[PDB]
Amino acid sequence: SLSWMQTGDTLALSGELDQDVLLPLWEMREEAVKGITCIDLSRVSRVDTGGLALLLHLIDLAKKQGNNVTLQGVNDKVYTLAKLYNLPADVLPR
Amino acid sequence: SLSWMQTGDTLALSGELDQDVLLPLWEMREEAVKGITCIDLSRVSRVDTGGLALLLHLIDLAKKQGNNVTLQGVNDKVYTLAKLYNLPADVLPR
Amino acid sequence: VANLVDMRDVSFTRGNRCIFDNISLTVPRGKITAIMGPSGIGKTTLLRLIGGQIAPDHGEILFDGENIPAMSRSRLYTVRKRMSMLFQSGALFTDMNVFDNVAYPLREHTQLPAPLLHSTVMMKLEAVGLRGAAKLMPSELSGGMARRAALARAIALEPDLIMFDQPFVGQDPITMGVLVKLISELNSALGVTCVVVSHDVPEVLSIADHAWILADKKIVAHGSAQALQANPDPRVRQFLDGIADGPVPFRYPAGDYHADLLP
Amino acid sequence: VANLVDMRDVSFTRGNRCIFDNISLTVPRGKITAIMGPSGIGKTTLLRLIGGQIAPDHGEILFDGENIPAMSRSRLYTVRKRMSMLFQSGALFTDMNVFDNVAYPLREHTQLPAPLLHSTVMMKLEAVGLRGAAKLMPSELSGGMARRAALARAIALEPDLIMFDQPFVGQDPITMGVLVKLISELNSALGVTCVVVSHDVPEVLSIADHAWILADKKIVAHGSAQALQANPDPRVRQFLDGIADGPVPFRYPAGDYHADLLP
Amino acid sequence: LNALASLGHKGIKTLRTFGRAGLMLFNALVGKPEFRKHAPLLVRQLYNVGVLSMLIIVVSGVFIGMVLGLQGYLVLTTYSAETSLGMLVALSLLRELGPVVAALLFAGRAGSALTAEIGLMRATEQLSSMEMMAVDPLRRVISPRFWAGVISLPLLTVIFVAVGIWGGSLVGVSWKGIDSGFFWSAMQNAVDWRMDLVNCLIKSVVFAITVTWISLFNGYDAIPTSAGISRATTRTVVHSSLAVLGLDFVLTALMFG
Amino acid sequence: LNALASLGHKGIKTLRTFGRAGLMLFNALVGKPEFRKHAPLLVRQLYNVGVLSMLIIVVSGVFIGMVLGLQGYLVLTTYSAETSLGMLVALSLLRELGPVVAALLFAGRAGSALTAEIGLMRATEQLSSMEMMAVDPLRRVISPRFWAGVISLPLLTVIFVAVGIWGGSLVGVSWKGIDSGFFWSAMQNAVDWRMDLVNCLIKSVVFAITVTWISLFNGYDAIPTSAGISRATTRTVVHSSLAVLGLDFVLTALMFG
Ligand SMILES: Nc1ncnc2c1ncn2[C@@H]1O[C@H](COP(=O)(O)OP(=O)(O)OP(=O)(O)O)[C@@H](O)[C@H]1O
Numbered sequence A, B: 001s002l003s004w005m006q007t008g009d010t011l012a013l014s015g016e017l018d019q020d021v022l023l024p025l026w027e028m029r030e031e032a033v034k035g036i037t038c039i040d041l042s043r044v045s046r047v048d049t050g051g052l053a054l055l056l057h058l059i060d061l062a063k064k065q066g067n068n069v070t071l072q073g074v075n076d077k078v079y080t081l082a083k084l085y086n087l088p089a090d091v092l093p094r
Numbered sequence C, D: 001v002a003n004l005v006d007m008r009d010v011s012f013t014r015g016n017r018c019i020f021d022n023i024s025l026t027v028p029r030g031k032i033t034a035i036m037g038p039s040g041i042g043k044t045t046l047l048r049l050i051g052g053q054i055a056p057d058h059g060e061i062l063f064d065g066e067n068i069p070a071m072s073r074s075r076l077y078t079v080r081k082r083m084s085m086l087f088q089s090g091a092l093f094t095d096m097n098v099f100d101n102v103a104y105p106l107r108e109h110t111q112l113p114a115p116l117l118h119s120t121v122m123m124k125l126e127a128v129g130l131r132g133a134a135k136l137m138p139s140e141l142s143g144g145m146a147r148r149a150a151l152a153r154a155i156a157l158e159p160d161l162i163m164f165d166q167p168f169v170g171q172d173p174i175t176m177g178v179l180v181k182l183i184s185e186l187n188s189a190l191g192v193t194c195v196v197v198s199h200d201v202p203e204v205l206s207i208a209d210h211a212w213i214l215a216d217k218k219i220v221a222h223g224s225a226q227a228l229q230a231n232p233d234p235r236v237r238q239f240l241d242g243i244a245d246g247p248v249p250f251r252y253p254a255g256d257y258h259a260d261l262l263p
Numbered sequence E, F: 001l002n003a004l005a006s007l008g009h010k011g012i013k014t015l016r017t018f019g020r021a022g023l024m025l026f027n028a029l030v031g032k033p034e035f036r037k038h039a040p041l042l043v044r045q046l047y048n049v050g051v052l053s054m055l056i057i058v059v060s061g062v063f064i065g066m067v068l069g070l071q072g073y074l075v076l077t078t079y080s081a082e083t084s085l086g087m088l089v090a091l092s093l094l095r096e097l098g099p100v101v102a103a104l105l106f107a108g109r110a111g112s113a114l115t116a117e118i119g120l121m122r123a124t125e126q127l128s129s130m131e132m133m134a135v136d137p138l139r140r141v142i143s144p145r146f147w148a149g150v151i152s153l154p155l156l157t158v159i160f161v162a163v164g165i166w167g168g169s170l171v172g173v174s175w176k177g178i179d180s181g182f183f184w185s186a187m188q189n190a191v192d193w194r195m196d197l198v199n200c201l202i203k204s205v206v207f208a209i210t211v212t213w214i215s216l217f218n219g220y221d222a223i224p225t226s227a228g229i230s231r232a233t234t235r236t237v238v239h240s241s242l243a244v245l246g247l248d249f250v251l252t253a254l255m256f257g
């Protein structure tokens, strides 16, 4: 499951993040982002490579209409994959 | 050149020992050995592998008609090839 | 139990040779296990046997509690999403470019959005340091870059066990130095077990944790890294230290020096 | 002058690549010289060039004072009795047995008595420790014994220079341990020079006396054994010690991380 | 007898290869009749075996018709019948040489080079890694090639007979002085449709089932070293060449018995 | 034009291979006509290309004669002339199919597998080490193979026509009810010696010069990796198969013009 919520200005996410549950959340890419400024990483249990890339896409097109999105709640598995694929600052700042 | 002499009971040898000069001395194999007991190694300058093997044949058929041939005058190049091909005692004693 | 792979007592023999009598090995989780033997007897043999290409004649092989040569055709197809391999020559489809090769099994095993699929395979080429070779045909790959591209193809469906069919042979110490650096991270990050099977002592010992020396058909003298560095058995001293003649003969069995050179 | 082989200033280029600009090397008598490299940038190229298979476009090559690509057809045939080679795969005629292969060039270059010729080639199989493999076809040779048989075929006409086209690749440390033991005696005994050309640092340094590291097209940083062990140049520290990334890049030249994963 | 035990190994061995040929092909054409993937996958294979094999057929097809029109012209003139040339080379091509020679050259070009691509694909373990991809290659890489043969060779024969019979209409009509309206006229009422025209296809389509199967089987059980694969290529040409004549003598007995 | 420069590379490239084919063969047959070494060396090569190619010729030779005796039997009966069968299959074999089909199968078995042995012998550098032995291989390994062809194929044709014409004498005489003494009788005064019997050899011996040369050249300039060698084998079969029909149309023009 990839249930997700909003606060009106901040996108929430819950459930697990796999490469088999992410396709309906790809269908929401313009009503999903609403001038978002933060991303919770609240109830993630596993992160996958494409689910990281889906995470990487949502922050990126949250530019040019919205805010510079802050990050929090990371379970320190994504930071392992961060320097692994040596992702730059301007696509993923913390 | 592969000039060679006898003493009546001991085969002498002179000149160089190459793989290109040894074929007439192969033709002498029964008039060459005359109950020989010693081999001089007097004027050898180079020894070859087949010329060693020609040397190894002359001592060997000097058995069963003649003596147990003593050896001398070796320039200490043949002793290098001796343990190289690990030649036993009964075919080459010193 | 953390033991991912465990074969109990495998008895092979193709039919004339009788390789693999009384073999046994355990592969736990989080490890970098290592198998080393004479040279050319187990390498492609055991790895296709452990993969479910060749069926044994005795024993049982576990992958988290399931017997491997007893599954269905469909069920053993499904467990192939877990484990993958990496061949000694590098198995690349020649009639493609290197992008489509590494992005191949994503199109065969999952449904992905097209700009999303394109991006997530592009970053994984950076994960092996091979992003720049993006649209090359697999002919101009100079060998060294060929193995790394199949390695990025190996980590596709998040594999939990990656079989390394001799990654280290015939290569430069800079290229061997690259491959030990990549394979060190991929067990530390991502928690992936890997079964390296080779014969290269001063490289495999820098990464292994529990080696298994397969000298004869038996699994004689297996252990950890520093334990096998001090075992004074004549087999393992000859193999790891490269002794010229021990129990393994220097020469060949032959006759005496009396009739062979004296006809 | 004891310098057997000396090429002055060779300038190659097949036509698109420009390998070998400003190369230079001296090979003296009694030595075991050694040539390294990065990974396939000289190996079969230089050795057929030094043998008189491929003509250069510049420079002069000496073998006791004679220019090699200026001799006649007949005269350069005659100097081939001096020098010989040993290929990376082992060049054995497949439609023979291993006796006739090692006894081949004796029937092509000298006149010998038949029981004498049979005996003198039999002992030379003992010289490589391969007397027992006497009448085998070159298919059941298991690789390791294949190189040693061509090595006994190499020492046929008492050669004074034996080119070793990568003897050390893809083999077991016992088999590498055999080949360093044999090649040590054949320079000590018989005074034969040998030009080993490979890339295997912890084996070639145990036997060499004056190495020549051919990193780029130049012959940069050549010297003796312990002298190149302390040279802190970034090329020779990366190559001999296997540093993962120095001047040789880790990754490939590519674009930025802004348009490749963000389409 | 000591020598009769060496035949006892062979009589079991040579029959198990026939068991492998049926068992490989039966797995190749059963289950999942998917058409979304194969329809661009197959049409790339017809560029491999159809288009590259097209040029050799037509440039050899003009030489057979020019020879039969030349050699047949002497045999008719000694029996003094000019008009029979049109019902000779039409007769000879459409029932004898059309199915037999075109299948020979197809075994030559497309028969051998298909076997090379299979055994090489196992030699670099592109086959053995596709099992780790959990895609069954026999429906995936064999059946695009197998249907690429049996569809091709009937369309390789009808191009052969036509350009063969056109070259026959050159040397007799134009060069060796025969009226053009007379040549086709004897050919019009020469051959029927029911036991001649479709009969050319029956001889040709049953050849394509054998040659494509005998080619792609030898790639599947060849020794993957570089020695055994070229041995398998020259085993494919010699085995198809017996099977085309081993079938044609049977298939000429039923139609004309 | 930008595309016409891609043809400018080819028009120079494809002519330099013809320069290599003459230059290799000219060095192969000049100087040192030694016979002490070659006479046991050559007779081992005739076991390679003559004896192994013998079985495929005879088992296919009986099928051609049985087909032509079957198919020819319908064409004579519609023109009501029984005796013409003996002067038909003798006619057709000895001047048309004898030189053309036997050379095809010889290009099949012996044409391809000779090229495999050459390119493999350069792939393991048995060629490149023989230059270090200072023995010129073109007189040493090529000319034992080249003479092994042109001596063989005339003796491969005369075995083909004979076993071909014997099978033709089965199905017409024995099975399809024709007197035996009548069949050879029309065949006796059928064909002469001067423009028929030696003419079969002239068509066959000029094929052996081409097929053996076109086979052993492709082994000499093939890419020594395992991919390029099997490419060269299927380039040898397709190039000989045009050259046998590219010559036969010329060689049927002179004899019957
Ligand atoms: N049915 C068979 N399939 C494959 N190889 C077989 C078979 N029967 C016998 N063999 C022999 O056993 C060997 C199996 O291949 P092998 O495991 O040696 O490949 P490899 O990758 O070279 O392994 P290594 O590097 O350890 O030698 C082959 O060399 C082959 O000669």
Ligand SMILES: Nc1ncnc2c1ncn2[C@@H]1O[C@H](COP(=O)(O)OP(=O)(O)OP(=O)(O)O)[C@@H](O)[C@H]1O
Pocket: D014, D039, D040, D041, D042, D043, D044, D045
């Ligand atoms: N005319 C040519 N002959 C041979 N190789 C050529 C030629 N032109 C270009 N090349 C390329 O140059 C290389 C020459 O062979 P190379 O010296 O690399 O063999 P090697 O034994 O692999 O040596 P190394 O180990 O240094 O690669 C080949 O890989 C080939 O692709």
